Design a binder for these strands. Structure first.
Ligand SMILES: [Zn+2]
Lengths: 94, 363, 49, 60, 151
RNA sequence: AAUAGGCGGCCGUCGAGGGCUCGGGUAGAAGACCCGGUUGAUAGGGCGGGGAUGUAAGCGGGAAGGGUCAACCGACCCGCUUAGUCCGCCGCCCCUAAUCGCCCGAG
RNA sequence: CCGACACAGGUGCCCCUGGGUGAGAAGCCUAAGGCGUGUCGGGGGAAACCCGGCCGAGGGAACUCGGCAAACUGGCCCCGUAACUUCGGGAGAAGGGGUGCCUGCGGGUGCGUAACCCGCAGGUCGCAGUGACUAGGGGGGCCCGACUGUUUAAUAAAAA
RNA sequence: GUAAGGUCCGGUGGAGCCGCCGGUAUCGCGGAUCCUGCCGGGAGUAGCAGCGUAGUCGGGUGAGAAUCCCGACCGCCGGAG
RNA sequence: ACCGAUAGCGAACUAGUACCGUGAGGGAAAGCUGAAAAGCACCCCGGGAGGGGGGUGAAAAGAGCCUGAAACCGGGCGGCG
């Protein structure tokens, strides 16, 4: 498990979604896949993707996102509004 | 009008998904010798060999190319004996006895960080298939049940006896849930059959002990699935005229005015593949031990091609090399039985002369 | 609260297309507060626009 | 043609406009006369006994 | 509307609530109310929350044309009427408040009657081919619920 | 199969056996089917194997000629280089996620 | 704006168009300007089948009423072009060869090594040099009408 | 009551109504692809593609945001969009 | 001894009004709270619409207002299943 305040390195395999969507529907699908993968592997209720990460994914157009992505995941606890302690996973490049 | 054979065969209808992924054998051959009539394995892959032909024909005594299929064959576990009496309309099972739980040794346990070895046992892998097994079932209870079955056989109410066997995917590391099968025993006397099953109850059977090299077999398996397929692929109809504005891959007319209904024989779309099929007269070229094939009493070669079989692991146990192709996707459970309707001039029952075996990367 | 007025007036003031106007994302409140051409000019001089 | 496409060519001058006499939009502007009352072409009003609109106006 | 179809309502052991002119599907409202009937109030609220969250399909027994099945037993046609569930959750909370202010215990309330009716139809038109204008109508729904405190 | 079958086993007179949710295709239009689920190699990751193209970027040298026949420019060639890039295939390693939870159920 | 409509039609293509390739107001890429409103979104080896597009071994019209549809050729330079003929044409007939990049020379007009064109020699890379885009397939007989042009707006464009 | 129908009992309603005799009439409903109004199955289905397939990530607003606003990135027309 | 709001003039009412056609010209639908507004003061929930209490009234007749049929739809009840 990932605790609050610790950073981990993840290698998201975006390729797994390449052949299940139309070629022109691959960059946003890769963004969604990154979001879901980070949520699942960090057990986080919400995830914040950095604009730099989004630009890296959208670097080569809407049809050619990177096959693999290397991201840094940092977990934080909100514990605000009384809705339990939601876990926020921040994703950054490298 | 112009005549022609109809598209497809009506002898395999309905073309529906197979009832069970585990194939069923409906008929058995008649053999004098007392042995189990067949075996089970997992389909691994395909390769080719060059062999001196010994089967009758024009190409006799000449080296020939020959495609062969590999079935990994871990030893089977004989864990039940069943008896059949004669009912009003056919055979009906009278009794069935399974052996009590015993420790399992061929389980490939791994020592992970923390905790000791799992220390698995029988009735623990079998639960994944049955889920309801006897409790407090002891050796004395098993012995008395066997005695009761033998007394029934002596009385003569029993007309047949068969063996309940289980596969062991865990030894080859394929999976853990076993497949339970019911096999008839060759011979004539129920007493001989009962003794043969009893002496092996709770023990292991090897394809080397069961089958013979160079004999003809029938292969039973569920074919590869193709999903829903249109009539062009399902039955082989001809494409419509290229000028058609309503499609090309469909039947033109699905019937006349009378009868005022669609006849069941008209080709139509539906499930293709995943059907229970039987292929007759397939020669058993070789049986290999521990994934190794011996050629000339001083040369042995790993049967696994470089890089492993595609979509499959590495052959580590006994295996069967059979001529030609067999139905089923990779890793499918394949049943084999002795030839049920063999020809009259059969090939000799012995391994042929193999001059070359292909082990090059098949991927 | 939709700064179409401010964007168009700034474009007219600066003599350029409306797509070449940059509004500080951290001062949209002040941009909305500015409602007259003079306020828009003040924002342009300050650097918000 | 002859339908929807031709109906798009109605952006020219209107055939009839408001009439200074009867107040209806029936004044032929190109020919300079009214198709409802005859203004600009006849001193007297355009009335016909086969027409009922002038009676409709007064509920007669 | 104002009235209720319930017969033996009394102001001591029962509490009622209603909603009128809801821009939702009366068919799906009926299908949802069928399952909501005869259930505890808190359990019904949890069921509606699950339906909204898309974790539990609502079965269809009357209006189920061209509807695909769902995983699990009893499916069969099913779907997720999120809009209807959200609309009915407000009515459920309103009846809960009514019971609480009347003095009943929310934890012991059981939905003994709940029904949906088709209300007034709001009319409009959509243009079609060949000069045809065709009806385009919104069907509103009335919802009525009365719960009883079990003892 | 309305004569709507046979047998072994487990349960009942809280409770065997299941469903949703979870990681995946030997499957698939929705359903369904199949493997795995800490009793673990299901997928990801790391390493290795086996493949598909065809020798990367960078640097050194040469180059038809030009140029003060100097410096310098130069398509292209050679060496580091069976390289580099990628792998909808395979093996080993529990490093990460297969968790938590909810529901039906004969009497 | 008109067509019942926030209609892919008509009215208005009514007046105007930076850079590169290129003969070009062509095709493609791009600057200014505009837009994400030619307005329902999400999922998926999640099929069969339908509509648009790409390729396809060997044979090459055996299909069909009929080569319908698609394919072949395709730009520029050089050579070389038939029957017939109203001597103007046919004609880009047909058919054949070349085409990139780099290092320099020579010629035209020019004050100019400014700008635009026209040739020559050498080296060199690939399957392919009009490498994308743009971009004719051809020939031989017969009937009708001389030719350009007009016609049943909404099944006939023709020999009428 | 063979009947066209009449009359009684129990609810709603709040203001007119009937028996018998003799006269009068726009005097008796299933159709006329009848007229006017309302409401059904088709159906929670078709359609919301084809001629230009366009959005994504952070922040803001607001009870509520795929659809509103700002920044960045990716795109489309660019002899007209 | 005419009709009684699909009847009677097309119009019982903001009717030759709104609307259709370039034009000549064609031309609808639409009446009723209560005796008196006495037209629901205050309380809880809801973003709102409105819901539940509580008041007015002989009776909600609650303005979506005299009566409230049938078609059609939802629930309960009884029968089959
Ligand atoms: Zn006039």
């Amino acid at each position: 498990a990932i605790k609050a305040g610790e950073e981990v390195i993840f290698t998201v395999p975006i390729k797994k979604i390449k052949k299940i969507v139309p070629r022109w529907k691959r960059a946003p699908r890769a963004v969604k896949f990154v979001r879901e993968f980070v949520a699942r592997h960090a057990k986080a209720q919400e995830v914040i993707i950095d604009p730099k990460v989004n630009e890296k994914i959208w670097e080569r157009g809407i049809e050619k996102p990177p096959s693999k992505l290397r991201v840094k995941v940092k977990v934080e606890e909100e514990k605000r509004e009384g809705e339990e302690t939601v876990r926020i996973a921040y994703v950054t490049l490298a | 009008k112009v005549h022609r054979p109809r598209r497809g065969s009506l002898g395999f209808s309905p073309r529906k998904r197979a009832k069970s992924i585990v194939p069923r054998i409906r008929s058995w051959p008649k053999e004098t010798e007392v042995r189990m009539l067949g075996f089970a394995g997992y389909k691994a892959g395909m390769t080719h060999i060059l062999m001196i032909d010994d089967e009758p024909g024009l190409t006799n005594g000449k080296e020939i190319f020959m495609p062969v299929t590999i079935i990994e064959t871990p030893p089977l576990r004989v864990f039940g004996i069943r008896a059949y009496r004669m009912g009003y309309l056919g055979l009906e099972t009278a009794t069935e006895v399974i052996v009590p739980d015993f420790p399992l040794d061929n389980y490939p346990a791994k020592e992970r960080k923390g905790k000791p070895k799992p220390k698995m046992t029988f009735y623990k892998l079998l639960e994944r298939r049955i889920a309801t097994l006897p409790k407090n079932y002891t050796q004395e209870m098993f012995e008395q049940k066997l005695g009761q079955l033998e007394d029934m056989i002596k009385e003569g109410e029993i007309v047949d006896v068969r063996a309940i066997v289980a596969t062991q995917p865990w030894v080859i590391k394929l999976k853990k849930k076993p497949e339970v099968m019911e096999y008839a025993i060759g011979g004539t006397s129920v007493e001989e059959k009962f003794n043969y099953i009893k002496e092996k109850l709770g023990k292991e059977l090897r394809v080397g002990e069961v089958l013979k090299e160079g004999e003809l077999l029938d292969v039973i398996a569920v074919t590869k699935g193709k999903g829903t397929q249109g009539p062009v692929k399902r039955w082989g109809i001809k494409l419509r005229a290229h000028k058609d504005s309503k499609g090309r891959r469909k039947v033109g007319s699905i019937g006349p005015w009378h009868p005022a209904r669609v006849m069941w024989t008209v080709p139509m779309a539906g499930q293709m593949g995943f059907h229970h099929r039987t292929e007759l007269n397939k020669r058993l070229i070789a049986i290999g031990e521990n994934g190794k094939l011996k050629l000339d009493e001083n040369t042995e070669i790993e049967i696994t091609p470089k890089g492993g079989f595609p979509h499959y692991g590495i052959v580590r146990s006994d295996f069967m090399m059979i001529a030609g192709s067999v139905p089923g996707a990779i890793k499918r459970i394949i049943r084999v039985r002795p030839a049920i309707r063999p020809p009259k001039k059969k090939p000799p029952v012995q391994r042929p002369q193999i001059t070359y075996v292909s082990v090059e990367s098949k991927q | 609260n939709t700064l179409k007025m401010q964007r168009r007036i700034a474009a007219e003031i600066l003599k350029c297309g409306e797509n070449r106007i940059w509004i500080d994302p951290e001062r949209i409140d002040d941009v909305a507060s500015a409602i007259t051409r003079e306020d828009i000019k003040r924002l342009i001089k300050e650097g918000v626009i | 043609g002859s339908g929807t496409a031709t109906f798009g060519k109605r952006n020219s001058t209107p055939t009839h406009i408001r009439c200074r006499r009867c107040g209806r939009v029936s004044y032929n502007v190109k020919k300079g006369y009214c198709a409802a009352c005859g203004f600009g072409r006849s001193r007297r009003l355009r009335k016909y006994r086969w027409s009922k609109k002038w009676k409709k106006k007064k509920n007669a | 509307r104002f009235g209720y179809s319930f017969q033996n309502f009394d102001p001591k052991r029962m509490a009622r609530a209603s909603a009128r002119d809801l821009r939702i599907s009366p068919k799906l409202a009926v299908e949802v109310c069928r399952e909501l009937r005869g259930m505890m109030l808190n359990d019904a609220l949890r069921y509606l929350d699950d339906v909204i969250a898309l974790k539990r399909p609502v079965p269809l027994k009357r209006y189920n044309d061209s509807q695909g099945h769902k995983p699990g037993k009893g499916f069969g046609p099913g779907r997720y009427p999120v809009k209807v569930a959200k609309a009915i959750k407000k009515v459920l909370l309103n009846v809960k408040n009514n019971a609480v202010q009347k003095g009943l215990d929310p934890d012991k309330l059981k939905i003994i009657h709940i029904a949906a009716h088709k209300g007034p139809v709001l009319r409009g038109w959509y243009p079609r081919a060949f000069g045809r204008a065709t009806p385009f109508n919104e069907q509103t729904t009335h919802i009525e619920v009365v719960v009883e405190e079990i003892r």
